[PDB]
């Protein structure tokens, strides 16, 4: 009979550096680097496979929520509290632009596949679609009533999707900025993030109710909920991870990251290390390899690998 | 220094 795998994620490097809490943390496209944005104000980089750091990137005026990398890997685009996002060049660490248009502190941003797109979600309760090239922003989504705490493009670009602590995920059509579907829980509890599967079927979606959910956005319906970790308090990144198992991963409020099983749910391994809220996960393009980072009493960057 | 996704709700 067949045999499920676990997998055996261990620490291989901690990456200390960062002054205050780290916000997110990212791998590169090309799985070369790992770049991270931090309450101190800076972007730094690292190597993927070893911590190595490399540089340092500055210029926003205050603490930094998100950082996204191009498909080139050759950009970055980070959000920050100075109501702006900028755009950088990795190779020189130069401002390129300042994306400026948002009210209020800018919360998460991504590329789009092509690149020649940002989103941005803001406590200003838009949803901004910014040209790279130019950097003007395209379109303001007038998406939700609260903090938007995620933003992501579907594997095409064709597809955005938000979430927000009003309660909603919304699916919007990035040519027209029309809004296609509004996912509603009964009581909507607030949405803390949300991203696109893969294969742009599904969403994965966090609440601050102590769950996650994967959702089927076009037929409306929730499909597997995750649950055992704790999240009430922060916006918090989950993912897939396609590379080995498929699997469900995420940060926790207990200082763990939680990885499940995305069919039957079960929480198939737990890794302890930080010392404060594990904030942000990422799962590296093409080796079984997890990037963890956490908050003010930790201010530290984990690396673990699994065979499998 | 602070960023809005380090703070609590």
């Known amino acids: 009979k067949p045999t499920p795998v676990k997998p055996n994620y261990a620490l291989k490097f901690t990456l200390a550096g960062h002054t205050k809490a780290v916000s997110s943390v990212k791998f590169s496209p090309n799985g070369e680097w790992l770049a991270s944005s931090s309450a101190d104000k800076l972007i730094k980089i690292w190597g993927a496979y070893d911590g190595k750091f490399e540089k340092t990137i500055s210029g926003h005026k205050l603490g930094i929520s998100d950082v996204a990398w191009s498909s080139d890997s050759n950009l970055l685009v980070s959000a920050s509290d ?53 950097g003007k922003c395209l379109k303001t989504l007038p998406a939700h009533s609260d903090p938007v705490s995620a933003v992501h493009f579907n ?37 803390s993030f949300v991203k696109f599967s893969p294969n742009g079927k599904y969403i994965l979606a966090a609440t601050l109710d102590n769950t996650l959910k994967l959702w089927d956005y076009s037929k409306g319906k929730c499909l597997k909920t995750y649950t055992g970790h704790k999240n009430e308090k922060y916006c918090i990144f989950a ?30 391994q737990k890794l302890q290390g930080h010392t404060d809220v594990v904030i942000s996960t990422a799962c590296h393009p093409t080796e079984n390899i997890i990037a963890s980072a956490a908050l003010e009493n930790d201010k530290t960057i984990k690396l673990w690998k699994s065979d499998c």
Not at 239 to 268: A, M, P, R
Request: hydrophobic share 35%; net charge negative.
């Open 82 to 134: 100075d109501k702006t996002l900028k755009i950088w060049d990795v190779s020189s660490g130069k401002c390129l632009k300042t994306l400026k248009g948002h009210s209020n502190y800018v919360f998460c941003c991504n590329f789009n596949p092509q690149s020649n797109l940002i989103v941005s979600g803001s406590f200003d309760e838009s949803v901004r679609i910014w040209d790279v090239k130019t």
């Open 155 to 191: 594997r095409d670009g064709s597809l955005i999707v938000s979430s927000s602590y009003d309660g909603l995920c919304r699916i919007w059509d990035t040519a027209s900025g029309q809004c296609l579907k509004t996912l509603i829980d009964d009581d909507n509890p607030p949405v």
């Open 239 to 268: 993912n897939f991870s396609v590379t080995g198992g498929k699997w469900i991963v995420s940060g926790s409020e207990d200082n763990l990251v939680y990885i499940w099983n995305l069919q039957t749910k079960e929480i198939v």
